[PDB]
Amino acid sequence: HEMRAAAFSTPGLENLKLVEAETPRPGPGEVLIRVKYAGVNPLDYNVVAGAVKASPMPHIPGSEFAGVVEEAGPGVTGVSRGDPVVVYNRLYCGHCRQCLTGWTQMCEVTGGGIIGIVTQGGYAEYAVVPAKNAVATRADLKEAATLPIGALTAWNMAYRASISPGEKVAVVGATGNVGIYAVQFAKLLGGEVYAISRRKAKVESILKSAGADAVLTPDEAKSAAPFDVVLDPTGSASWDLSFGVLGRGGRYVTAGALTGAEVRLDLRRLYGMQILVIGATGGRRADFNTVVRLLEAGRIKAFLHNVYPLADVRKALEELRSPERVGKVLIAP
Amino acid sequence: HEMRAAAFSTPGLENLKLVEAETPRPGPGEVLIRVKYAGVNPLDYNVVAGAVKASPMPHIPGSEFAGVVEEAGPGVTGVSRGDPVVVYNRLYCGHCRQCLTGWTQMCEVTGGGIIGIVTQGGYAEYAVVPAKNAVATRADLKEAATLPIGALTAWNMAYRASISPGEKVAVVGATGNVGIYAVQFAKLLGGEVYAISRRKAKVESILKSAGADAVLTPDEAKSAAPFDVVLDPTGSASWDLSFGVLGRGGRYVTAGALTGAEVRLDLRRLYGMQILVIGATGGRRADFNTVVRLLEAGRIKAFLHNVYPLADVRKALEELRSPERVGKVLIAP
Amino acid sequence: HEMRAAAFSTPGLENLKLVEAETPRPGPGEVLIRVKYAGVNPLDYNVVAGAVKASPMPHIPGSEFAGVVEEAGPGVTGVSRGDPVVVYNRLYCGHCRQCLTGWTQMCEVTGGGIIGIVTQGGYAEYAVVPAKNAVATRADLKEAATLPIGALTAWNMAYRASISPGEKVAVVGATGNVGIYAVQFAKLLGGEVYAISRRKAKVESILKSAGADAVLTPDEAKSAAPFDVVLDPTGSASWDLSFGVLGRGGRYVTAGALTGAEVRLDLRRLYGMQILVIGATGGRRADFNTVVRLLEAGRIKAFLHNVYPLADVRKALEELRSPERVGKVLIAP
Amino acid sequence: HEMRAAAFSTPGLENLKLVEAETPRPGPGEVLIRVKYAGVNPLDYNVVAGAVKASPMPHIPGSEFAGVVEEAGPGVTGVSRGDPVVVYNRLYCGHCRQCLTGWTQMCEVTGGGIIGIVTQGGYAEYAVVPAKNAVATRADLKEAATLPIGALTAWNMAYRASISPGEKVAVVGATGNVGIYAVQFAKLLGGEVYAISRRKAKVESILKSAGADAVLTPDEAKSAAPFDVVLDPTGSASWDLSFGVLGRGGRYVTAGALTGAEVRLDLRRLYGMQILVIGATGGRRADFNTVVRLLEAGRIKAFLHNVYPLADVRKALEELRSPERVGKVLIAP
Ligand SMILES: NC(=O)C1=CN([C@@H]2O[C@H](COP(=O)(O)OP(=O)(O)OC[C@H]3O[C@@H](n4cnc5c(N)ncnc54)[C@H](OP(=O)(O)O)[C@@H]3O)[C@@H](O)[C@H]2O)C=CC1
Ligand SMILES: NC(=O)C1=CN([C@@H]2O[C@H](COP(=O)(O)OP(=O)(O)OC[C@H]3O[C@@H](n4cnc5c(N)ncnc54)[C@H](OP(=O)(O)O)[C@@H]3O)[C@@H](O)[C@H]2O)C=CC1
Ligand SMILES: NC(=O)C1=CN([C@@H]2O[C@H](COP(=O)(O)OP(=O)(O)OC[C@H]3O[C@@H](n4cnc5c(N)ncnc54)[C@H](OP(=O)(O)O)[C@@H]3O)[C@@H](O)[C@H]2O)C=CC1
Ligand SMILES: NC(=O)C1=CN([C@@H]2O[C@H](COP(=O)(O)OP(=O)(O)OC[C@H]3O[C@@H](n4cnc5c(N)ncnc54)[C@H](OP(=O)(O)O)[C@@H]3O)[C@@H](O)[C@H]2O)C=CC1
Ligand SMILES: [Zn+2]
Ligand SMILES: [Zn+2]
Ligand SMILES: [Zn+2]
Ligand SMILES: [Zn+2]
């Protein structure tokens, strides 16, 4: 049997093509998913662009997705055909020091390898993943597909920031896929949350309904300093502001380098202020369960921008640069 | 009454001269100390050289000292005449947010101010300090005089590194005033400790006497990676090595910038490895008590190099640079 | 001046008499407050009844009050005449192990001595408290006066329960002075909050306005088990229920012994479930500032029942046992 | 193929017989182990006696053992024939909240089921265990065989006591299988360790070689209060001592109910002192790896007492009560 898929044999958004692919088949411990929705993320854009190398080639991208189990492989229990699932996107062995402490995204054995990057992903009608990565959910699958990358990454960032109730928390890029959940989880944890945006005027009512106590331009951020925590995955163009608005014991937490990876760090201010500069990536397997349950209970919300058919995958990827996008862009195969 | 003291009316090492000075008198809340031993540290050299503004001017430096109480001031209790004491050198208000959570070195009211920098210090026969800053001790005052700067700062770096039993801990600059205690505290917390030094041949048996499991040159440290924790206050010249040997979840802890303050921090590696880059300064007032108790009970050892009389203070501060020094330079007024 | 005051020269509520007393005067480090509101709590009742020895005799009770500074003592700066304040009620030295690590209610030197118990309290027009115990606030002093005992004790219980977002939290005695804030703080930390009441039908709409996700009868609590955290200051009559509904790694936190002090603890279920049974009392000096600012911000809400004048003080204390009460009972001198 | 085995078809020491039994064969995910040494614990005693129910019946006991992989079932990687292994004794699914957060001994799926209790155990020439439970080690298997019950359980008690360097930690029953390692771990975390024994004269030197700073009689212990931590798996006969010697913020941690499960708990002292009473059982799978490495590194030591052959399994079990015993009793099949 065969399937529709978006694939590229050489990198470049222009080489991403609708094709007819061989439908994959789950082996032991694997399930085959009929994909209902896949998110559109910087990660996916960058796999397509070649900035992140992929296997196998030619490659089907798509690391954030949800759908219905079509077939359980040999020996799979716990998930069965017809189950609506959402996929944890990190391959983990379950037996290394990192997996056994809960840090399955840091797996020493798989190298943190990511579904849709070191496997064929979900911009496709079907995808195979390990059964243990498929989390059964009763949530609307559009909303679920915003969880594996956006919500979970934001969760892990907020968890590693050690937010105490009443602490002031700035979220940089609060309008983005990660940010908009970063606002929510910082509020969940008791923070007073200041959402930072270069388009405050358009976005203020949205970010407040995400739970922001205040929306600030970058300039307003400077005056409102100091903050106890800055959650900022946007990279080096934000560094002078985000590093400079921290107070004593302030924690800068990043999981991305959107505008560049290299920053000039003043160790004298790092130690003079007792600041912590903290890396976060992906999220823990147990935390992904929590984030799913919280969506299902309505304690967090999914902000959707637009759903594209699989054939418009290119237009969908471009919509990531749209100055009007607030919310998640989805592909529906 | 007059006393001998090393003072400088204008910054610079050649401008540090022995003089006859007005003997200070303790106000309410203060104690007058007959200084027995003062430590010689980079902080003291930088005060005398002018990299740190000091007051009053002319200025008696000396931020790390121990001695005997000569007189208690109005309303002081708990500290009678002749009590041997060692002096916690941060001025703190005891009422601000930071003081009230225990981060007394971060006090918002005193500007973190340091005895012997914003007050006249211990390179003199007598000095005055707040009574709350004077810790009674039964320890040999030569050894007590290594605790306010070297031991306490190393204590506070180790504490903020979250050392678990069995984690691999590298100490860069391990031969120095801070590193020699950092080796000890890392072992005390149950780490497996790798002291790093450019003088391995000369210093190996001393760093083992301090509790190091292994003693490595910089190159050898690259081969022993990964490390869970790198205690390293040496600044930018060690950054590539120190940051490059960290494993997943690794903590870099710095309290200094000896060789340079600016480093190029790569956010991609920080988030991809979930590393934390952590600043540490001084130590908490309660932890200084603990450090003093640990010396009195023999759980940590002072490593001494030379004692100089107060007349030789120029020679004492130049010994900081000597490639034969391993251990603490003391001044005895 | 003379002032009015409730007072008892010998224990017993009938022997509590409105009198005219020597208006007290503030020494160094003290302030004299003009009490506007004072809360009524089991602690005030039990002090009046002789259960808790009081000093000095005859004694003015009243351990939770807010008002306006009448007169700064000598050397007191950082507060003015006419500044509205609310009183942190534990006396603390600021120099012991406990004070320096932030646990000022555990002070080794005052023994945790309480204002209105070891000093003349705020069931009176004026009272003298240490200046450092007096917190400036811009909130309604009626609501402020619910914080020194009710909110702060609840905060410290929730803080010591280690609530993660999504954990299930039961609050026994949610209708009371402590419970009504424990519901709120548990929600602030991201818990799913189940308030348990013996009078669900009457109080349910109130406890939901305090933030409870559900209100439960004791039988319904049994059916909703397991719970991650149980905040329960009610003592032994609630023990079998609260301890029995805990799940794996569950935490029982109490600050009270309302219905009895002794419980039969099954060590085999404690270890087999890895449960923690945790004590909590009072609150930290720094957290009191956080509770004040959270009231000022609107993030917590005070629930008031009735305000009595100093004349009807015995009726106000008798209102504690009133089975219709939900909220705080204030005395207004 | 047949093997030798100690087995009982009805509970009671007298019913434990040496038998010839069918040699077990490993299925998928399992390894067969030629047992070289197995520990003798109260747990194995109570299984043979009937206080702990077991399956299957008739039953081979033995929950703490090490040996050599003889065969691997289908699809087993990471463990091979010839590997010298020590067996983590909790069965764990690896997919539930407890497992994915690292608390494998609390698995919701297996109930925390223990090898040799719900499976055939190690009092035999061969046993089958899950491959993921077999930890290859370079230690002497005689010493490894003291880790699965004695060492790991102590580790997990110490872990859950949150021992700060310098804190006073009491170990009740320090002479026992668990206590002899608890002493060690408390010292490695930086505690000042007071070992408690009813036979101090007889055992003082041994406990001091395990790392105890002082050895105390029960009466000496009351006089040496307060302690910050009491590690005590001995149950109710020690409760008044252990609970009563705690200071402010003290932690009582238990993993056992040796002398009785029921204790009368004064909630009012619990909260007035902010004590935590903490259950601990087994240990985490990740910590078990940490414990084996510490043994391989000499940072902890095995205190052996006697090694019996399989046929003497009765006298080895009876050897648990020998008032001379200090050390592990072992069986060697
Ligand atoms: N480690 C991991 O597992 C993951 C890493 N990431 C990384 O995190 C980063 C963000 O991802 P995501 O939230 O989806 O990104 P989005 O593009 O959805 O959001 C980024 C937001 O940042 C702001 N922004 C964009 N450009 C700039 C700029 N030049 N200067 C200042 N602000 C800017 C915009 O907000 P506005 O216009 O309102 O100001 C924008 O909405 C990326 O680098 C991504 O690779 C993401 C997911 C997971
Ligand atoms: N924040 C605070 O409260 C405090 C901060 N500090 C700061 O910490 C830093 C260290 O102080 P201290 O321990 O007294 O310093 P020391 O000079 O006593 O020790 C520093 C050690 O670093 C090593 N070192 C020197 N230069 C280099 C280099 N180019 N590359 C690699 N290693 C080098 C040397 O070890 P070797 O030759 O064996 O390799 C030396 O022994 C200073 O910057 C000081 O200002 C110090 C005390 C308190
Ligand atoms: N350590 C400290 O600093 C402090 C300690 N405390 C202590 O905490 C405890 C509670 O204080 P507070 O909130 O002021 O008390 P309240 O009486 O105001 O509230 C107690 C609540 O518990 C429930 N309850 C009352 N009696 C019983 C009973 N007989 N059996 C079962 N449930 C009952 C009731 O709720 P419902 O009827 O709806 O079920 C009642 O509203 C007291 O023991 C007090 O002494 C209080 C403040 C500070
Ligand atoms: N939860 C879990 O995963 C585990 C739980 N356990 C439980 O922990 C408990 C202790 O185990 P273990 O160390 O093997 O036991 P041991 O008998 O080996 O040691 C107990 C020690 O306590 C002291 N003691 C013994 N009896 C009494 C008594 N009658 N009164 C006062 N002190 C006494 C003795 O020390 P001395 O004579 O020197 O005073 C003795 O050496 C047991 O109940 C066991 O079942 C054990 C392992 C794992
Ligand atoms: Zn792994
Ligand atoms: Zn301060
Ligand atoms: Zn105190
Ligand atoms: Zn499990």
Author numbering:
A (entry chain A), B (entry chain F), C (entry chain K), D (entry chain E): -1 to 331
Question: What's written in the study?
Answer:
In the present work, our attention was focused on a thermostable ADH from the hyperthermophilic archaeon Pyrobaculum aerophilum (PyAeADHII). This ADH is characterized as belonging to the medium-chain dehydrogenase/reductase (MDR) superfamily, with a size of 330 residues and a structural Zn2+ binding site made up of four closely spaced cysteine residues localized in a lobe at the periphery of the catalytic domain. However, previous studies have revealed that PyAeADHII has peculiar characteristics because the enzyme lacked activity on most standard compounds used to test the activity of ADHs, and was active only when α-tetralone was used as a substrate. PyAeADHII, possessing only the structural Zn2+ site, may be a hybrid between Zn2+-dependent medium-chain ADHs and non- Zn2+ dependent SDRs.
For these studies, we substituted the PyAeADHII enzyme-bound Zn2+ with cobalt and measured the spectral properties of the enzyme in solution, we obtained the crystal structure of both wild-type (PyAeADHII-WT) and cobalt-bound (PyAeADHII-Co) at 1.75 Å and 2.2 Å resolution, respectively, and determined the co-crystal structure of the NADPH-bound form (PyAeADHII-NADPH) of the enzyme at 2.35Å resolution. Examination of the NADPH-bound structures points to the catalytic region in PyAeADHII and an arginine as a possible residue involved with catalysis. To possibly identify residues in the active site of PyAeADHII we modeled the substrate α-tetralone into the NADPH-bound structure.
